[PDB]
Amino acid sequence: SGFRKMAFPSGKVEGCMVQVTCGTTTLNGLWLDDVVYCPRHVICTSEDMLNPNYEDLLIRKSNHNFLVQAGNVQLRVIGHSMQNCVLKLKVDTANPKTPKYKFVRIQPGQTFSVLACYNGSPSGVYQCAMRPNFTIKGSFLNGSCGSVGFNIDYDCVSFCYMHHMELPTGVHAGTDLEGNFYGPFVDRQTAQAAGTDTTITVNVLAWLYAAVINGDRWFLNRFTTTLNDFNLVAMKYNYEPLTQDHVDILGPLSAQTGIAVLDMCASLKELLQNGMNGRTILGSALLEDEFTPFDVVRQCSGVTFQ
Amino acid sequence: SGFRKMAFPSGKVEGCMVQVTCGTTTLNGLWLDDVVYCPRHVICTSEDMLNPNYEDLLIRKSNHNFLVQAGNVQLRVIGHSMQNCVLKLKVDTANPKTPKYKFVRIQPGQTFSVLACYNGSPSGVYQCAMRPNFTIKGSFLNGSCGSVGFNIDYDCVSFCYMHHMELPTGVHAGTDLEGNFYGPFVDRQTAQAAGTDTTITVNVLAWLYAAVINGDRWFLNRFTTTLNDFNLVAMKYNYEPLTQDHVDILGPLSAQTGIAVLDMCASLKELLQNGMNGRTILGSALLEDEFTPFDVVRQCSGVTFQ
Numbered sequence: 001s002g003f004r005k006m007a008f009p010s011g012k013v014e015g016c017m018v019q020v021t022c023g024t025t026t027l028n029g030l031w032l033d034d035v036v037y038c039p040r041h042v043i044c045t046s047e048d049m050l051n052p053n054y055e056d057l058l059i060r061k062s063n064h065n066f067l068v069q070a071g072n073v074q075l076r077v078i079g080h081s082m083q084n085c086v087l088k089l090k091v092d093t094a095n096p097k098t099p100k101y102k103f104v105r106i107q108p109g110q111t112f113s114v115l116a117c118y119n120g121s122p123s124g125v126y127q128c129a130m131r132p133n134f135t136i137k138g139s140f141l142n143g144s145c146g147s148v149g150f151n152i153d154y155d156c157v158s159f160c161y162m163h164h165m166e167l168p169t170g171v172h173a174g175t176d177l178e179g180n181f182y183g184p185f186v187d188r189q190t191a192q193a194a195g196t197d198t199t200i201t202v203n204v205l206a207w208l209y210a211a212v213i214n215g216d217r218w219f220l221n222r223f224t225t226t227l228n229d230f231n232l233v234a235m236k237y238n239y240e241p242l243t244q245d246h247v248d249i250l251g252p253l254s255a256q257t258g259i260a261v262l263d264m265c266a267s268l269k270e271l272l273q274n275g276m277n278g279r280t281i282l283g284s285a286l287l288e289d290e291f292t293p294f295d296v297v298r299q300c301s302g303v304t305f306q
Numbered sequence: 307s308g309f310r311k312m313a314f315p316s317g318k319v320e321g322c323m324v325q326v327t328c329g330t331t332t333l334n335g336l337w338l339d340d341v342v343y344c345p346r347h348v349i350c351t352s353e354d355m356l357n358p359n360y361e362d363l364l365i366r367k368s369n370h371n372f373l374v375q376a377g378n379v380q381l382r383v384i385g386h387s388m389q390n391c392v393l394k395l396k397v398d399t400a401n402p403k404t405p406k407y408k409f410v411r412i413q414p415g416q417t418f419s420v421l422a423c424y425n426g427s428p429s430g431v432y433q434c435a436m437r438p439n440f441t442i443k444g445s446f447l448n449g450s451c452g453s454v455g456f457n458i459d460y461d462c463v464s465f466c467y468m469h470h471m472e473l474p475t476g477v478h479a480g481t482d483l484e485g486n487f488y489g490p491f492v493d494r495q496t497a498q499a500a501g502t503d504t505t506i507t508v509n510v511l512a513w514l515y516a517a518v519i520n521g522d523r524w525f526l527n528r529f530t531t532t533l534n535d536f537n538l539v540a541m542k543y544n545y546e547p548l549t550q551d552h553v554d555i556l557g558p559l560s561a562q563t564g565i566a567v568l569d570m571c572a573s574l575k576e577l578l579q580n581g582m583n584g585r586t587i588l589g590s591a592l593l594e595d596e597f598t599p600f601d602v603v604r605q606c607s608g609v610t611f612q
């Protein structure tokens with residue numbers, strides 16, 4: 001038992017982290033086979049970042065302008081190209097630690113592990129959700145750009161996120177590994193801002209089920225509600241709509257606990273309207289929305305990776 | 307910026323996790339050099355666990371009674387011995403992935419990363435604190451025994467915890483890697499229970515400093531307090547005493563924020579007496595005590611590992 005904001009074991013990703021230097025800018029790259037992926041803004045000077053023409057900026061670069069450090073071993077860059085907002089640095093060595101991997105783009109509301117990295121050196125790992133507004137509430141300091149987010153299914157690393165920037169509210173924006181930003185963010189120095197977020201309702205419900213599985217039951221009730229009536233409450237508390245597909249996805253957790261999804265919705269409704277009256281759920285005094293139903297099943301049933 | 311309950315990158319530990327089977331019991335072992343460490347209760351049957359004489363139980367075992375699975379490669383056990391509550395299985399192969407490591411015993415209030423494991427396969431990683439009552443609020447399912455807790459300093463893994471059991475409140479008890487339990491727990495089936503816990507005051511203060519560093523300032527005030535007057539409040543809210551050494555340890559965070567430690571204590575005092583009035587700190591509506599000052603400095607300054 002117990003419930004922790006659990007990340008995937010990071011080893012498979014640690015073996016792909018490299019340091020990419022261009023000019024005075026050092027950031028992280030992801031070394032898979034003979035390509036190193038990194039944020040294209042690595043090529044930018046401070047003033048470049050004001051209004052960069054990346055095609056212009058990149059045509060003025062050479063392979064030798066990119067230093068790739070894989071631990072204490074330099075990789076020779078033999079090609080460079082831009083794919084959307086990522087750079088692809090072709091190197092003369094295939095990473096012998098390349099895991100089986102996929103480049104997947106995730107949905108807001110889904111979770112992933114982040115291996116926060118500095119100078120190509122992994123610093124820590126933690127679990128994030130993609131917010132409905134396509135930001136992530138990460139933990140990133142200067143030099144963290146190019147750190148990647150990922151999930152692991154058995155032995156395959158699904159890379160879904162690479163860090164590009166911190167928005168003014170302290171939240172983070174980045175791309176998938178094809179270089180396409182999550183959300184309406186750009187890798188230049190605009191006044192861009194996160195914009196309004198919502199709470200991930202299906203995840204809160206999942207987490208309430210995790211709570212029940214772990215013996216927190218005080219928020220349960222005999223009440224039930226209809227999906228429409230719940231969604232009327234969800235909307236008022238800035239929760240996103242619950243769909244029938246969310247209900248279906250919660251089926252296994254509902255079956256395991258014997259609490260009908262709509263009964264849990266009634267509990268959530270009460271929690272939203274009454275708050276928690278000084279009590280806690282799974283050690284939180286807030287409704288937690290960064291665990292998916294999958295995360296709950298994984299942690300309250302016990303799947304591993306290899 | 308941002309603040310996440312961050313674990314160390316787990317790769318170095320992942321390479322040490324093996325599966326140990328004895329009889330029908332399968333659990334995790336830690337494979338370092340040519341020794342596999344695992345909970346000694348691996349040798350126990352269900353009825354053995356009632357009142358086990360481990361010396362008797364172990365003398366009746368042979369090397370061939372221990373199957374060690376390192377991934378999909380079996381390790382040949384060539385020796386076994388008991389060290390307190392851990393078994394040391396000597397195997398004929400030194401783990402080629404053995405990191406530089408130490409066996410350290412931590413203090414209540416200190417934190418570590420847990421690589422939760424099943425059948426020798428790492429499942430997830432998360433950050434724990436050793437509670438004042440020597441339990442940890444982990445996330446462990448059946449088969450997690452032998453999963454280890456650790457910290458990483460540059461390239462050296464300091465193993466500090468190996469999981470042995472879940473107590474009735476859903477918290478977890480285990481040993482250091484010399485096999486000595488943390489706290490007054492035993493690897494047998496008694497009615498043992500966690501016993502009373504306290505909140506780790508210096509950690510809460512550290513986390514308040516992390517909050518300030520991250521722009522949460524609403525809980526600040528011009529007030530100050532004396533250490534004795536703060537500790538009078540701490541005691542009443544079941545917080546553990548703040549020592550001058552804690553104050554000293556908070557020095558760097560105090561210098562970085564310009565908030566005197568005793569001023570932060572005054573803020574904590576107000577938070578304890580008034581609660582938080584619907585506001586949050588670093589995304590929590592509770593005072594968080596599982597970040598040490600070190601964890602805060604590490605995450606709000608940016609140290610890596612290699």
Ligand SMILES: *C(=N)[C@@H](NC(=O)[C@@H]1[C@@H]2[C@H](CN1C(=O)[C@@H](NC(=O)C(F)(F)F)C(C)(C)C)C2(C)C)c1cncc(F)c1
Nearest residue numbers: 041140141142143144145164165166167168187189307
């Ligand atoms: C990564 N090493 C670092 N981030 C950057 O260098 C990004 C890159 C350049 C500037 N930048 C920012 O994150 C900035 N944000 C913005 O300009 C924004 F508000 F998002 F529009 C700063 C650092 C000024 C907040 C790009 C926008 C392409 C970095 C990443 N994460 C956290 C950090 F503290 C630093």
Ligand SMILES: *C(=N)[C@@H](NC(=O)[C@@H]1[C@@H]2[C@H](CN1C(=O)[C@@H](NC(=O)C(F)(F)F)C(C)(C)C)C2(C)C)c1cncc(F)c1
Nearest residue numbers: 001347446447448449450451470471472473474493495
């Ligand atoms: C690990 N694979 C599993 N834990 C055990 O097998 C421990 C070992 C045997 C029984 N045990 C327990 O954790 C039990 N606890 C107690 O007897 C206690 F309350 F602590 F006294 C059970 C599982 C009945 C709660 C030892 C006590 C030596 C395990 C570990 N962590 C979580 C799990 F769900 C299971």
